[PDB]
């Protein structure tokens, strides 16, 4: 086992194949402990989950400081934090996976390259190298800074995202809201008038598939 695993891939290869809460250590530093939910089952596992929508109990209409730091219950609905995502994605080359499920239907998207810049970039999104079944709805968002109501699409749709003008992906939108562009949307799967029941965003090293 690795004493200070830096992500869910290093925590897994530590043998632990059960999805749930694990401690990772940013940059392998024992003073940078971070509790994460690891999805150890989806496409070989080793995923840090950083967003989960599943029941609408948690409020995602939250401010810049909340999106920077993270909020919610890692076992239920939560957002891991942009500062955490920046620090994780700085560690090496990460891939993004998005898992969606609505009324029994599933879809996914994988982006071979995924990074989140630091606060001086307003946590700029990089997403490249799409594959999947959900449809490439993050391409629209590539290179965009993060937006909250207090730093306007976030206000206008009551969510938070790497908004452009405004979105094809709104996974931090209003739960169960089927009004145009208000809900948990992935446009190229279910459009703008269908709020998705279940959504997870997760990351792991892009080289995991052959390590």
Ligand X SMILES: O=C(CN1CCCC1)Nc1ccc(F)cc1
> Taking contact as CB under 6 A, which single stretch among the options 7-15, 66-74, 141-149, 198-206 is the one that binds ligand X?
66-74
What are the helix (H) ranges across 145-208?
153-157, 187-190
Nearest to 205 by CA among 91, 83, 126, 81: 91
Beta strands of the chain (E only): which ranges?
20-25, 33-39, 47-53, 71-72, 78-79, 94-102, 105-116, 125-132, 169-170, 185-186, 198-205
Q: Is 72 in the site for ligand X (CB under 6 A)?
A: yes
Q: Is 85 in the site for ligand X (CB under 6 A)?
A: no
State how far the Cα of 76 lies from the Cα of 176, in Å rounded to an integer: 16
Q: Name the residue nearer to ligand X (CB basis): 80 or 134.
A: 80
Q: Is 80 in the site for ligand X (CB under 6 A)?
A: yes
Q: Name the residue nearer to ligand X (CB basis): 78 or 94.
A: 78
Tokens of 167: 């979105």
Q: Name the residue nearer to ligand X (CB basis): 33 or 155.
A: 33
Q: Is 46 in the site for ligand X (CB under 6 A)?
A: no
Out of 61, 71, 149, 198, point to the residue binding ligand X (CB under 6 A): 71
Q: Is 74 in the site for ligand X (CB under 6 A)?
A: yes
Q: Which residue is nearest to ligand X (CB)?
A: 70
- Min dist CB 196 to ligand X, Å, is 20
- Tell me which residues touch ligand X (CB under 6 A): 69-72, 74, 78, 80-81
């Amino acid at each position: 086992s690795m004493p200070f695993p830096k992500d869910c891939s290093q925590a897994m290869l530590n043998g632990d194949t059960t999805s749930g809460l694990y401690t990772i250590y940013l940059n392998g530093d024992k003073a940078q402990a971070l509790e994460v939910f690891c999805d150890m089952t989806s496409d070989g596992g080793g995923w840090i989950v950083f967003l989960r929508r599943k029941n609408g109990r948690e409020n995602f209409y939250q401010n810049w400081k909340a999106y920077a730091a993270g909020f919610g219950d890692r076992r239920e609905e939560f957002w891991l934090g942009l500062d955490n995502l920046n620090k994780i994605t700085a560690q090496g080359q990460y891939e993004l996976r998005v898992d969606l499920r609505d009324h029994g239907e599933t879809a996914f998207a994988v982006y071979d390259k995924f990074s989140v810049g630091d606060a001086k970039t307003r946590y700029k999104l990089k997403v490249e190298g799409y594959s999947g079944t959900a449809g490439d709805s993050m391409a629209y968002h590539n290179g965009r800074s993060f937006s909250t109501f207090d730093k306007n699409c976030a206000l206008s749709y009551k969510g938070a995202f790497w908004y452009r003008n405004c979105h094809r992906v709104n996974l931090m939108g209003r739960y169960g809201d089927n009004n145009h562009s208000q809900g948990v949307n992935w446009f190229h799967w279910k459009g703008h008038e269908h709020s998705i029941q279940f959504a997870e965003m997760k990351l792991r090293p892009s080289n995991f598939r052959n390590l």
